[PDB]
Amino acid sequence: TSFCEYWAXXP
Amino acid sequence: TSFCEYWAXXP
Amino acid sequence: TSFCEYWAXXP
Amino acid sequence: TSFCEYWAXXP
Amino acid sequence: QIPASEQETLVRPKPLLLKLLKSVGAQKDTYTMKEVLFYLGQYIMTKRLYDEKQQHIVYCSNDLLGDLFGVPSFSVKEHRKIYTMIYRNLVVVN
Amino acid sequence: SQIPASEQETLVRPKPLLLKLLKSVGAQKDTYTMKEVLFYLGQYIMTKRLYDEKQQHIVYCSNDLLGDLFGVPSFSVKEHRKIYTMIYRNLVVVN
Amino acid sequence: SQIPASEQETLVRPKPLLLKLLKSVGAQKDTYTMKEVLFYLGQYIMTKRLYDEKQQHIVYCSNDLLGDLFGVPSFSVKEHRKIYTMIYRNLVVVN
Amino acid sequence: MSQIPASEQETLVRPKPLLLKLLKSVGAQKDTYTMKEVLFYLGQYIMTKRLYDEKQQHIVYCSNDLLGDLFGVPSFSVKEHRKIYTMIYRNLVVVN
């Protein structure tokens, strides 16, 4: 799982 | 703006 | 479970 | 505005 | 540059839905989808349209809300069905 | 779970004061998600009518178990961060 | 336990075309939540680079099974409830 | 804003100088943001600088980076949601 997926799972 | 940003703005 | 709780679980 | 409305605006 | 989410989408409610929203003290003609859900929830709560024992069942026969849904009742648990009613009663500011 | 978890999906083990609060509203377990903690905490304030009738974001908690968790006589639910701070200080995250 | 589910927690059984798309990005089950369906569909579009490089909200899927999923050669990610409509038509909401 | 209660993502904040410098480095041109905007631009920053571990992309290395001065740590995990909010709130003033 990507950074963007991890970030989206806090905008 | 990126695909991932568009997709996150419907999970 | 209350109407309020049902409603909060679609704003 | 009700307590429940305030509370729903942190589940 | 920040894309809008569904809740942040601006909408222009049609006359019947607009009358409903304005009946609970909302005083404008353009709303976010979040505001539409908020005022619709307020309307159901103020008029106590829910079944007291199964509070996800909303009764709306002989009411402005029943005119919108085209039905005497609906269940809050069926999220997409409620969005479909709402979208049929507004114009998205796209 | 494969897909990343959001903050509300965090599994937590409430500490004794918060566990007692959660169980007083009928919740009967020891491990919760943050969503469940928020849900049952909201039920507790509402059932006990701890909020101010005129300004319903103000919660009074002097002489209540909630006051022992918050460490203050009253709080506003408009200050989201401060409620999350109180919650995390009253639980251990299952990490 | 008595906590109502949100739309993203709805359990669904994708029909064969949608299921194949989800399995193509690594999912190994037949029943999903709506959140997992959105997660894997976004992962599918991203990995396969079906979005337009210059206008990244436009998805060009004419030579991809995703085009069959939507019933169109292209679509916009900005049309939120139109995407939900197409997803709901490609699954059965479990009782 | 509107009559409806605000959520935490809608909170208006004024980033302190280090966080503001990070936000402006990715093209943001204001002094007041919503918490959603801070999270959006912070995600763009970590992506642009490629600060995440290539194999475990929830781990962010911020030693020898502006972000490390903001966190006061050499790395953090995106999985620990509230620790990230705690760092963010320490680097801003919530607008009254």
| Closest C-alpha to F4, from E79, G43, G46, H3 | G43
Chains in contact with C, where contact means 3 or more Cβ–Cβ distances below 8 Å, are D, E, G
Chain H hits for F57, CB-CB cut-off 8 Å, are 5
Question: Which DSSP letter does residue G95 get?
Answer: -
E30: tokens are 């353009």
- Residue to mutate among C4, C5, C10, with most E CBs inside 10 A, is C10
∠ CA G43-G49-G54 to the nearest 5 degrees? 120
Chain G hits for F36, CB-CB cut-off 8 Å, are 3
> Domain H10-94: what homologous superfamily?
SWIB/MDM2 domain (1.10.245.10)
H37: tokens are 């905007």
Whole-Å CA distances, F40 to E79, F25, F84: 22, 7, 14
Give the three-class secondary structure for E50.
Answer: strand
Neighbours of E86 (CB within 10 A): 20
Element containing residue G37 per DSSP (H, E): helix G34-47
- Residue to mutate among G35, G39, G56, with most A CBs inside 10 A, is G39
Q: Nearest chain D Cα to F78, which residue?
A: D6
Domain covering G10-93, topology:
MDM2 (1.10.245)
Mention the CATH class of domain E10-92.
Answer: mainly alpha
E76: tokens are 């809050």
Return the domain boundaries, chain G: 10-93
Arch. (CATH architecture) of F8-93: Orthogonal Bundle (1.10)
For residues E34 and D5, give the distance between their C-alpha atoms in angstroms, rounded to a whole number: 12
**Per-residue b/e over H73-95, b at no fewer than 16 CB within 10 Å?**
eeebbbbbbbbbbbbbbebbeee
CB of E73 within 8 A of CB of E61? Answer: yes
Surface of C (1-11) touching G: CB under 8 A: 1, 5-6, 9-10
Neighbours of G42 (CB within 10 A): 22
Contact across the interface for E2 and H40, Cβ inside 8 Å: yes
Which residue(s) pair with H59 in the sheet?
A: H77
